Amino acid sequence: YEIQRERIELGRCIGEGQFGDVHQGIYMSPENPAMAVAIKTCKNCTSDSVREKFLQEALTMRQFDHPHIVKLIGVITENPVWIIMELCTLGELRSFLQVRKFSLDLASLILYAYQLSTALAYLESKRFVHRDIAARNVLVSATDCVKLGDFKLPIKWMAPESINFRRFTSASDVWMFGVCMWEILMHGVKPFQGVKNNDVIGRIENGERLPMPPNCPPTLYSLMTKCWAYDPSRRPRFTELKAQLSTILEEEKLQ
Template structure:
């Protein structure tokens, strides 16, 4: 329970998921990054005391005020958002938030918490949307192992989305620690804060626009047409025999670029450089820089990712073999201990019966 910290919040705690959906039209990107930073600091504390949360999502985060959230897990999600859990064996698990090693082998570590925190940041920047809402629970692990990840939210800065993708690295050893995430999120928050201040300063210094009333203006005069001389009846090139205006000559200072004028005589036979110069250069997005520039480079990237995936699978297979060996060893040890106890108890019973028979024999 929280007391009233700001106007608009009840005395009872508000779940972050509901808060994001109700205030998605007023929340600023700076506030969303601040929420992520506060949650990361709480998880860094848990990591320091070797505690694993195992269920990091907006349904388990409480809003104390408009600029303060608290991490918790009081079992509310099992009752409020029961459809977000997938029944596996006996327990119900949040499959769409879990790391691949948690889905496959039920292994929960600080690295798996880092994966879930990345999904939680995606929820916050998406204003409470459920991750992989377009997939069934049983299809999530196949999509993850194929290499697909959650897309970048619309309002998410590129640097923050890059940090999310680092949290979703398949290899657990390559995921960042929560202490590193706290530093990265602090830098991103400070950068966005400086950008917001700069925008506000520019808006204050910019003079107000003066809107002048619309006035009816006379249309501009029509351009004068060149006068053609009379030509002979059989001369087909006569329409072309006129003087070119000075403004269209190459030496004229008013002729800035070939894109402003094309000759009506032969526009299809202009030089290739002039034809291609009319196309404007489009700005490249961030993902265009990440795409391979050639087929050979794409093949190399694919082979590198495939080798890394095989290495991870081999390591997991070796771990499974070692686990099975350890289980068989423990089983044999347990059986041997039980046999030893049975033999000892049998010997004790026989010795006890011998003593009783010795006492029962009359002297």
């Protein structure tokens, strides 16, 4: 998986990332003389502590093979350290939704939620807990294809047991997925706008939940509310979410 630097032509900055900016580029590779790629960069990669955390992402991504999870291409492990990934040419999901807010039909938003459920059902099948499911970590490969893209605390996405006890499980992933579904149906608006991170848990324990997005089908909003059961053991699993989303999507396409 090591790629010689000379094989990479660093292009335009596409977006921000957790450890540094992400660029598009070209990988002049034996298998393909001009492969379009994404290049993740890492500021402070001279710190062994940061460089280790950054490169853990590569190791994690390499374990997975799913149509809606971005693929690792390779790594450059000399400074400046880079991760070379599959390029999703339409970029970050939040920006995509905001920009195409009045061009994307309801069926598209539901499709994106369903596709993400397929990736998350796959991760569940491997007993892998993600811990940071949110629209910011989803990328857009085509108008009909999103991919999970990334492997201080995101309090406004987190399940109550994660905020209170730093417990992260398959069940807490489902709570976060419910929030991500809300975000999609809100065309990339953040949850709990105007609320301080410290006040979120109080509202959750008081039984408050994100309201039904405009134009959201009632079946879909109800699925979100199931994800937001206070008791983790009452939350659905991703097999059930996938199934229900598939039915909602088909219903919507039949309108």
